[PDB]
From Swiss-Prot:
Subunit architecture: Homotrimer.
Intramembrane segments of this protein: 259-287, 336-370
Residue numbers binding L-aspartate: S274, S275, S276, T312, V353, D392, N399
Comment field on protein domains: Contains eight transmembrane regions plus two helical hairpins that dip into the membrane. These helical hairpin structures play an important role in the transport process. The first enters the membrane from the cytoplasmic side, the second one from the extracellular side. During the transport cycle, the regions involved in amino acid transport, and especially the helical hairpins, move vertically by about 15-18 Angstroms, alternating between exposure to the aqueous phase and reinsertion in the lipid bilayer. In contrast, regions involved in trimerization do not move.
Species: Pyrococcus horikoshii (strain ATCC 700860 / DSM 12428 / JCM 9974 / NBRC 100139 / OT-3)
GO biological process: chloride transmembrane transport; L-aspartate import across plasma membrane; L-aspartate transmembrane transport; protein homotrimerization
Name listed for the protein in its UniProt record: Glutamate transporter homolog
Residues reported to bind Na(+) 1: G304, N308, N399, D403
Residues in compartment: Extracellular: 29-39, 102-119, 217-228, 319-335, 371-389
Matching InterPro entries: Na-dicarboxylate_symporter (IPR001991), Na-dicarboxylate_symporter_CS (IPR018107), Na:dicarbo_symporter_sf (IPR036458)
Amino acid sequence: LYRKYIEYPVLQKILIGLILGAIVGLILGHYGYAHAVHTYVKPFGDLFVRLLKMLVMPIVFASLVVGAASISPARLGRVGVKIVVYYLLTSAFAVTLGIIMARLFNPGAGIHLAVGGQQFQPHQAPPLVHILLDIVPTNPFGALANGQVLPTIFFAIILGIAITYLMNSENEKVRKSAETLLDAINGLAEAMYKIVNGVMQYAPIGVFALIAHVMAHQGVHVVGELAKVTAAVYVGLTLQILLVYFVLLKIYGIDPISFIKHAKDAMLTAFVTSSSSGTLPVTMRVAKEMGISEGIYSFTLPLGATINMDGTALYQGVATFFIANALGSHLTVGQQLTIVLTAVLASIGTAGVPGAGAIMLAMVLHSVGLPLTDPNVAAAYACILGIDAILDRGRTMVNVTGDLTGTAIVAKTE
Ligand SMILES: N[C@@H](CC(=O)O)C(=O)O
Ligand code: NA
Ligand code: NA
Ligand code: NA
């Protein structure tokens, strides 16, 4: 029944793997068979970790190039300024709210990951001058091949901006050559998102092996911590709607009660599909009967479907704290502010494809000194990606909801 396995829903598939993973570890580990799990069940979980790390490098480079080549055009108009400034402010405030939830609920506190029998000891910090000057790569190819992600981000952003200037050039041969290069890079990004969909089909098997191995060694309190981070994200998402969207709507005069009733179809549709790109046709229909002018929502909505992601920004702030707390490290004031800047940039480049927001988490992990090369970081990294399907549902609703409420405010003031 191979076809039956594929057609079965992914979220219900992961939940089955997690429940049986806990049961197997407890009963088998109680009878003094812990080494059997480590020798046999662990290798099936190591494949999931290695598969996740492969997708990190091609996705970051390709998505940033195409993302930077679309919002670069300065000429937008008068309705193209209010929507842009609103998008940046909402994304920045989402990260701050996520930090508050992480510092309040304190997820991941109690477990000490010691993969390889070595506690995570942070390396000595080089001088700030060296760190800032190391962002510029000496060899753009070398940064991509060696796995350095901070130089990769800088080169991708400038390359995308330069492509935009070429497409507006007067010469016909230069314009044709610039469009071909962008399409080739665009086709690489789209091909990688299909691999992400195929990797998550193996996720229920990978989650089963990971949970079973950790259940027989670090007891049961690990599962309790996973519940705290799941509750922390959804609590923060709820406060995002009531304390930001509802307040702004009431201030400008738009009735929140009428807003939710007229936009319920979009939110539930985005919830089940977990995609903000396939929900766009549904979003276009909803705004029509609301009263928005045809021109207003024909420009902001396509732009906001890939730029305005408040849920992803809140998710990345909470997830980073969970990994650091599990490792036993401490976040300084300067490092926390670095999250507020890196998470906003990472959310802009994130694509609407489901599951693409946990691949950009590596951008903020490296920015705070937690590389994926460290075995301890990688083990904890795959722990939060295992339950990503559960968290992917809620965050997609907030991303779509921000686009609708942003359009209404602009349309109110014309
Ligand atoms: N699924 C989200 C993207 C993400 O989770 O990163 C969306 O469609 O907006
Ligand atoms: Na935003
Ligand atoms: Na969005
Ligand atoms: Na995005």
